[PDB]
Ligand binder design. Sequence first.
Ligand SMILES: [Mg+2]
Ligand SMILES: [Mg+2]
Lengths: 143, 146, 146, 143
Amino acid sequence: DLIGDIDLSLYFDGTKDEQNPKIEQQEILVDGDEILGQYLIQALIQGPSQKGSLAPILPKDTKLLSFDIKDDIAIINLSKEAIVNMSATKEQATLEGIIATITQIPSINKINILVDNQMVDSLGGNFDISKPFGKEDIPNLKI
Amino acid sequence: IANDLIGDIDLSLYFDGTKDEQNPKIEQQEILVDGDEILGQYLIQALIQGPSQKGSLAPILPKDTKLLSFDIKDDIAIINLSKEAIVNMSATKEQATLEGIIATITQIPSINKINILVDNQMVDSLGGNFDISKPFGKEDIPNLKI
Amino acid sequence: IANDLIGDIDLSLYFDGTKDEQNPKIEQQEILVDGDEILGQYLIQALIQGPSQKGSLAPILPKDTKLLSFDIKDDIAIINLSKEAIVNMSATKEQATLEGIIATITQIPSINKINILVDNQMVDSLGGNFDISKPFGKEDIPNLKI
Amino acid sequence: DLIGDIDLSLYFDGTKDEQNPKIEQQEILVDGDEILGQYLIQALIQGPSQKGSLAPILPKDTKLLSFDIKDDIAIINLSKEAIVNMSATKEQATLEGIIATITQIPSINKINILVDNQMVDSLGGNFDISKPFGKEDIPNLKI
Ligand SMILES: [Mg+2]
Ligand SMILES: [Mg+2]
């Protein structure tokens, strides 16, 4: 029950002489799980339906820099906008929301949040996000 | 649109990233494999190996020749060979060599000319009868005779 | 439908077909370039060259190791190495080596297992701690410990 | 005024285990001139319109084994069915017809007819087709 590795081609600008515009392919190999996970994180950042009563878990201006799956860990690389001052209850909902959403992909059991391609102590908040973590690890990461 | 035969392939090389002797770990190092360069490189290697002994064709480069590097700059194939490629040749044999390399390499659409180098440097000639000081295509061969 | 990354490319090698010393002539000799084999071969060569000195990663194979041949039989990559690949290694280092080769090679969709050979022959182990007597994939590594 | 080199893929049978049928690509590189020339020779073999008064130049059962362009020579490889007993006038029309048709491709100035991948003395007839020839060479090849 999956998509598996996907052969995709990206066309970038391969023009040098500027007389004739030309595009060249760059092939990439990704498993469906990264594409799906990436879509999910992007969906969380977009926020809940305005027709509902739910509240967002990440700032609207947050940008997903990259998403990668190393073994059973989802490396979620966010921009600086994700770091804001939050209450311990709100920050805990954010981390539980990301985990509950991402762990829907069976291959993923833990998440490792990074900011600007670098490791960070916390998004909010009172939670330590220095290393990878799963649902079980949340209460133990309070500071 | 570019007519590259295979095009770039963005992949990873997994090397040893171990710290804790308890858990072996591998980390990626990116490699942008340029398909036309790997294909071209394979073709030149194939020419150096020579024709099948089961056929009647003759070699175009010495067997001990070694391909130092192969790179594609725009539409030019920089074929960097070792010193063994430079030997005494007749004008008819040397012309077949240059035409053979061109005919083989120009199969890669992105390539229209070749620039042969020896030991990462420029050379006047392989055999003695043709000037390979600058890049050249099929059309340029008769004009390079010396 | 097959998911070969590059697939076969049917081309020609132009060698010297001259008879009349007056007219230099080149004749074709066909070459079926198997793209996945040339890519795989390039990747293994890249692993042997080692990681960038500008990084922190460590090599997985000795630098003097030489790739004798690389072939793809069905979904198995036959990686034929020279005697230099066999050295004394710790079980953690040897495991990283095998996982690194697999992780690198299995990027080519057509490959699911690797069969390492030394000097065109079968071998029990590279480092001493793992059995590489038969073909193996990622899943099979823990079961091959000796 | 041409088509130039054309990157084409042929899908053949790459199944071995017979459980899952699989096709694999074989890439080929041909210039438009060979494809066009090949089409023209195939059109000549099919013959003239039945609604006209023209007669065929090659037997209907003739099969084109291969068509290749070496420099300015069109190597037209036909099957054994092309060799039949012909009058010198009919055979001359055949050779002139093939040449007039093929030389429409500017890159071609001569033709080299082969039968079953091998060299042949004549198709009909009184004409020597042992080597490559153009329009000018026809009268000189009578035997
Ligand atoms: Mg390039
Ligand atoms: Mg194959």
